[PDB]
Amino acid sequence: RGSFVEMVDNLRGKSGQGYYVEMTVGSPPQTLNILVDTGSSNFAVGAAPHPFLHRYYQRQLSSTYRDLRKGVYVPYTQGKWEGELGTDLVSIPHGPNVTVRANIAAITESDKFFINGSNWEGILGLAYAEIARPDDSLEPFFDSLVKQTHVPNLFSLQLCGALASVGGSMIIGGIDHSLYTGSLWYTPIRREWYYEVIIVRVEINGQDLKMDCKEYNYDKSIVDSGTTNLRLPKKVFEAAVASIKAASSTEKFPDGFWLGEQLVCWQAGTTPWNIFPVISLYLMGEVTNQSFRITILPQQYLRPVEDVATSQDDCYKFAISQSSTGTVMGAVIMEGFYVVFDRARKRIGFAVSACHVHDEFRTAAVEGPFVTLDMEDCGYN
Template identity: 35%
Template sequence: MLVLVYFAVVLVMVNMGNSLERLELRGDPDTGFYLDVSIGTPPVLLRLLVDTGSSNLVVAGPTQTTGRKFNPKQSRTFHNASKKVAIEYSQGKFSGYMGYDRVLLGSLTLNNVSVAIIETSVNFFSDITDWQGILGIGYDSLLKPSPNGIQSVYTAIQQEYNISDLFSMKLCPARDVFGDTVVPSGGELILGGTDDSHHHGNYMYTPIVKEQFYNVLLSNISIAGTMLPLECSELNRDSTIVDSGTSDIYINEVMFDAIVKILKEKCKEDPDFNVTDSFWSGNEQLAWRIGNNDLYDMFPDIILYFPLYNNQSLQFGVKVPPQLYLRQVAPLHYDSFNLPCGDDCDFFVFGIKSRSTGIILGSDLLTGYDVIYDRKNLRIGFAPTTCELRDNRPSSSQPELIGPEMRDTVDCSYSTSSSTKPGIYGIVLTTAITLSMVLLILILLLYIVHCRHNKRVHHTESMERLRDDFNDDNHSDQSFVISPTEEAGPPTKQSLAYVESKKVKKSTPIAAETRRDTSNSLMVH
C-alpha cells in the first residue's frame, strides 16, 4: 500500500511539473495584447497588457479614467504595503502605492500577490487601448520599487503550482482595424510549455545573455539581400531585448539611418511610388487603395540574425517581411482626409523607430512568430506562426527562419555608450581630445623649463656684471653710499639702474607669457 501511495504522489508531482496553463490573448500590435485577470474579493475583472519588458502587476486605481478600474477599499482581501512605487516605461509612466491581494488567472488562484495601484499616470493609457493595467512577466530583478518583499505573478505561479520555468506566446492580431467588432484573434499565452499547432517547423534558439529583460544578441542585419556594414558591438549598443509590451521595433540611430537609406533607394525604383521623409520618421501614414495588391512587393525583406544557442559559431535569421514592419492602422483623421481612393483606402505606419541606444524587438515582429521564453535553459526560440497576419494582401514573402549558417566568431557583446553619436566617432573624438591635452601639457612643461633656464642665465649674467661694476679696489663698499657730488657717484648709479632695468625687461615678459599659456590650457579643459 505504501508503495502505491508513493508512486501516486510522484505521479502527481510529475504532472504538476509538466502541467500547462493556457490563457487567451487578444489585441493587436497597435494597442497591445492583453488577457483577463481577476483581482480582489469580490473579484474585479480587468484586462491587463502582457509585457515581457517588465515584472510588476500594475492596475488602474479609482483615480484613473479607464472604463474598468480596481478600488482596493472595496476588496476584503487587500492589504496596503505602505510603500510608494513609480515606474517609467518606454511609453508612459505612473506613480502609486504597493499592496497585496488575491489574483485569479485562468484556473490559477494566487493569494497575497504584490500589486501596484496607479494613482497618477502620464501617457500610460490612451483612447484606443482596451486594457486597464499591465501583467509583467519579466525577471524579478525588474521589480519596482525593489525586489525585496515584492514578488512577481510569474514567480508566485512557479512556487505555487510548480509549472515548468518557460512560457510561449502566440500573438495573433485582431483583423478588425477600426474596432467596430470584437474578432477573436486566436492568440495564446501558454505557461509551462508550447503547442506545436501554433507554429510551422521547429524552433531555432538564441541565448538569453542577461537575466533582467529578455536580453539577446544580434549578430547581423540584412535588408534587400545586403548586410549592414556594422560591427556586432554597434548593433548591440547597450542592449537588445524581446518585449511584447512595445508595439514597434526600436533600433539605434546608426542602424535606423542605414536601413532607411536602403528602403528609400528601393522605393525609388518605381517612379510613381512616392514615399515622403515624414513617413519614415513616423509622422505620416501611407494610404493604399483597397484591392491594390502589390504594396508589399514595393518593400524588401529585413532579416535579423542571432547567434545559435549552444553553437555560437553559427547564426540563424528571423525574416521580417513588409507586412510586419508596415503596420495597418486606423486613419488619423477619418472624417477629413481627401485622397483619390476616398473611403477605399487602407492606412499604414512605419513600424521601425529610431532611439538613441539599444534595440527593442516589439510586437510588430513578434506577431509573425511563435516565441518561446525558456528561462530554465536561458534561451529564446522563434518559429513562424500559424496566425493569419493582420492584412490579407498577397505577398511573395512570409515570416521564415533562415539557416543556420556560419558567422564571424567575433566577441559579440553589449557596448555601453553615454552619447547618441555612433560608437566609432565617439572613440575617435575621445582619442583626439586626449592626445591634444597630453601634447598641450608637454608643450607647456617644455616652455616653463625653457623660461626658467633663460631666467637663470640672465640672472647669472646680471650678477656677473654687477660684480664687475663694483669689484673695483678703490670703490669697494663705499660705491653705494658716497655722495652724488663725488666723482664715483654717477657711474655707480648708472650701474644700479642698469641692473634694475635688466630685471624688469626679463621678468615681465616671462610672467605674461606664462599667464597666456595657462589661460589657453584652462580653455582646452
C-alpha cells in the first residue's frame, strides 16, 4: 500500500497520441504497447499486419489462446474496428507480478482507429462491463484481474504532459504517494459504466458561469484518459469560451482559434500564459452539501503542436471543445492531477500531480471543502 516503485514511470507516449503501457499476451509472451483508456471497456489489440502497426498479436503463436467463436463489430463517431473474441494469458511487465486469463478482441479490420506514426497497437479499456462490446457479459480486463488475483480493486493514473515524449505512471492495485502533493479529494462515481461524476459549479478565473448546473452534466460527465480535450456540453462551452475570451481580451485571436479550426503561434519562449485564465470545476464531494474544486492552467488547455511543418514558431491548439456527449474530462484535466480510480469505494480521487506543467505564478490546485446545495439536481436523468 502507498509505494509501488516498479510501476512508477511505466507509461510512455508522444504529444497528442495518448499514453500507453507495455503488456504481454499469450505463451510464450508477446510484447505490445497498449493505449490506456478509462473511457472504454474492451481490451482490443491489432491482430493483423496493418501498415501503421509496429507489432501485432499473432494468436497462432500462443499455446494458451482460446477462441470464443464470436465476432464483434465496434463503430465509433469516426472510425471503427472489427475483431474476433478469445481469451489468453495477459501480464503487465511493469505492473503487479501476476498473470490473468482475459478477454481479448483480436482486431482484424479497422478504420481511423490506429494512428499513423504512433507506437501503440491496442487499447485497454479500464471502465465497466456495462459499456463493453458486444454486451456486458464480456468481462473487462480489470474485472478479470481483480477476480483472479489478490490485486486490490483500484488503480491510479499520473499523466505527465510535456516529436516530444510524454510519460506517466499507472499504479495498478494502489496509490503511490510520491506522485502527488497536498491531499486527495474524492467525488462519487455516480454509476459504474463510464467513470461518470457530477460537476456542480464552473468558474473562469474565479468567476462563476452561473448556469443551471444540470447543463454541466448534460447528458453525463466522465473522466476519460482516451480523449485529449476538455469537452464541454455545447451550451456550457459557449458560456465558457465567452468568459475566457473576455478574461484574455488584452489580445485578440481569430474566432477559428476558439473553435479548434486554426492554431495560434507566438515567437519561441514568449507564450503570454498570464493573459489566459484558470478554469475550475467543482465536483460533488463525499458528504451531503459538500464539494471540492480542481483548477487547471492554460498550460493544460493550450496544447503545443510540434509538427507544423509550415511554421518556424511556437503554435498551440485550444483544447477545450464543444461536445454532444456531455462533459469529458480528457488528458487536459488529467495532466493536472494524480487521479485515483477507487472502484472498491465507487469514488474518484484527485490530488495535485507532482509532475504537472506550471509556471512560477500559478499552479494546478485541488481545494475544499466548499458548501454547495442541491448537488443531486445537477445530475441528468
